[PDB]
Amino acid sequence: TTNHDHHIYVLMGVSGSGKSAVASEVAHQLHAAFLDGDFLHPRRNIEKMASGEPLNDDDRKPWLQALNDAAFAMQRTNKVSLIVCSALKKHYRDLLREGNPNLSFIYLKGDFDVIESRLKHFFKTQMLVTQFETLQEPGADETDVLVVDIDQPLEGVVASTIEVIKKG
């Protein structure tokens, strides 16, 4: 069952916002469980992503459930847990809450212009563009969402995810 004194934090945000970097460091600094949810795609999703083609909502289905399962498993033994998932749509976001009332989100947030500059192989204008078009920013009705500002170096983004996690 749910350990309402344990909590799961999902780092959301578009590709390039640095989720896995921040989350990684934040978790090594709170002796927290960390899971990069990209590792939880099924075997097909992986090949389909390597073919050049982007997944659709039906691929995402089993992916989100696994994340949901992992959240459920992480909270049994960890006070705080971090899961990385861009979770760009309300719907994916809710697919994550179903069953885990001890889950909330941390949005590493920036406007398109902010993030491009922050990246600086090579930078891909159109991938980022595609991330923003897919993104459904959490509205006010989404209250389990905490917001963090990426327009700072790593240390600060890191420092502010912590503060955000502590504040609450």
Output the CA torsion 39→138→148→104 (10° steps): -60
Is 16 assigned to a binding site? yes
Is 15 assigned to a binding site? yes
Is 129 assigned to a binding site? no
| 130 touches Mg ion (CB under 5 A) | no
| 20 touches Mg ion (CB under 5 A) | yes
| 154 touches ligand 6PG (CB under 6 A) | no
Is 51 assigned to a binding site? no
Cβ(56)–Cβ(44) under 8 Å?
no
- Would you say 138 or 158 has its CB closer to its own copies? 158
Q: How far is CA 23 from the centre of its chain?
A: 9
**C-alpha–C-alpha distance, residues 82 and 111, integer Å:** 24
145 binds, among ligand 6PG, Mg ion, its own copies, none (CB under 5 to 8 A by kind): none
- Would you say 50 or 140 has its CB closer to ligand 6PG? 50
Q: How far is CA 71 from CA 66, 97, 124, 159, in A?
A: 8, 9, 32, 23
Binding mask 39-58 for its own copies (x = CB under 8 A): xxxxx--xx-xx--------
